[PDB]
Amino acid sequence: MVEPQHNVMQMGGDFANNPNAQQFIDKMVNKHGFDRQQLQEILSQAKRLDSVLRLMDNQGPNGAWLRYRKKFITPDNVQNGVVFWNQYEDALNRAWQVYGVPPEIIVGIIGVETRWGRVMGKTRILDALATLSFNYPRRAEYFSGELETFLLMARDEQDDPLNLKGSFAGAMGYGQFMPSSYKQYAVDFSGDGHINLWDPVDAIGSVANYFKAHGWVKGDQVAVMANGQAPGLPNGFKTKYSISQLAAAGLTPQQPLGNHQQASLLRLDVGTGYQYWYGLPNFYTITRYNHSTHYAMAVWQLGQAVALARVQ
């Protein structure tokens, strides 16, 4: 009837003689009450993907921004964004009221991440996370905690750990949430009692709660383009200068900056020249989702493009 299989201490597969996997299995049993044998049967099925290890290692004015921008802001993309927006308008409006996060931001995020559920990932999450946990010393501790949370997530949502697919880093669903983002930020916005990252309505609320959690200020400006040039000052979303300093570099806000006394100096390579922007706090909040100036500007502008295509 019952098969304890205590004597089956050594598993097969790609992580068969892996010290890191054996340590992991011990932590899950001890700390979470997992059954060693059941876990071994799972991890023995996990694959060591060289592509995942190669991709994590892989990570003027020549028109940099334009090449990045046109990867997302195209007629076909803006049109699908309109459809997704109108289809999930109730969830989008409800998220605005509860979280203060606007529709165009959530639409832009889901748009750039998975093109609205069209490109969600083809790699099994266990393979990716197990590969980066047991064969990648550089980020092994970070990905171990992600595999840990993933296993617990698959247990809490009654998911079979092997049926779930996503990115090469183990990101999941419409919003490409990492296992730790699911734990800390995902919410049951659809109200069915479950938190599905692959459910459009849950994805919307979770992306909204993520933003609020990271300080998104309702109605506050995201960024404001500047008149003038400032080649002497360093730039990017991590920079920090006062409005007085920026003004001294020869800049001025194309729109009133409110009460803001500081901003980051963003610079977009528009081919013919450089375009400077006053990066406000809401812009930074976007980068907390994906640490990149280009990402954040692409998310915002994509949402803006879709906002206009609905107006018409």
Ligand X SMILES: CC(=O)N[C@@H]1[C@@H](O)[C@H](O)[C@@H](CO)O[C@H]1O
Residues tagged active-site:
113
Contact status, residue 81 vs residue 87, Cβ threshold 8 Å: no
List the single partner that 192 binds among ligand X, Na ion, none, CB under 5 to 8 Å by kind: Na ion
Contact flag: residue 181 with ligand X (CB under 6 A): yes
CB of 212 to ligand X, least distance (A): 14
Q: Look-up: residue for tokens 């963003």?
A: 266
Residues 6 or more apart in contact with residue 302 via CB below 8 angstroms = 72, 73, 77, 78, 81, 107, 108, 111, 112
Cβ-contact 296, 266 below 8 angstroms: no
With binding defined as CB under 6 A, does residue 171 bind ligand X? yes
Number of other CB atoms surrounding residue 63 within 10 Å? 14
**Using CB under 5 A, which of 63, 80, 115, 188 touches Na ion?**
188
Does residue 146 touch Na ion according to CB under 5 A?
no
Q: What is the largest CA-CA distance in the chain?
A: 80
Least separation in angstroms between CB 178 and ligand X:
4
Q: What residues form DSSP beta bridges with 227?
A: 252
Out of 20, 44, 180, 190, the only residue in the binding site for Na ion (CB under 5 A) is 190
| Residue 241 DSSP one-character state | E
Nearest partner of 204 among 225, 226, 189, judged by Cα: 189
Looking at the Cβ atoms of 152 and 233, the one nearer to ligand X is: 152
User: Judged by CB under 6 A, does residue 177 bind ligand X?
Assistant: yes
Sign, CA dihedral 135-140-144-146, equals: negative
Neighbours of 237 (CB within 10 A): 22
Query: What is the total count of residues that contact ligand X (CB under 6 A)?
Result: 6
Residue 144 binds what, of Na ion, ligand X, none (CB under 5 to 8 Å, by partner type)? none
**Residue located via tokens 């990101």:** 171
Q: Decide: is 132 part of the binding site for ligand X (CB under 6 A).
A: no
Q: The tokens of 186 are what? A: 């995902």
289 binds, among ligand X, Na ion, none (CB under 5 to 8 A by kind): ligand X
Q: Which is nearer to ligand X, 25 or 286 (CB)?
A: 286
Residue 200, both tokens: 């459009």
Among 15, 88, 276, 289, binds ligand X (CB under 6 A): 289
Helix (H) or strand (E) holding 5: none
* Nearest-approach distance from CB 182 to ligand X, in angstroms: 8
As a whole number of Å, the end-to-end CA separation of the chain is: 66
Q: Please give the residues from 191 up to 210 whose contact with Na ion meets the rule CB under 5 A.
A: 192, 194, 202
Q: Measured from the CB of residue 202, what is the shortest distance to Na ion in angstroms? A: 4
The least distance separating ligand X from the CB of residue 153, rounded to whole angstroms, comes to 13
Give yes or no for residue 220 binding Na ion (CB under 5 A): no
Stretch that binds Na ion, among 13-21, 182-190, 241-249, 256-264 (CB under 5 A): 182-190
Nearer to Na ion, 202 or 269 (CB): 202
Contact (CB, 8 A) for 136 and 57? no
Task: Give residues in contact with ligand X (CB under 6 A).
Answer: 171, 177-178, 181, 289-290
Task: Give residues in contact with Na ion (CB under 5 A).
Answer: 188, 190, 192, 194, 202
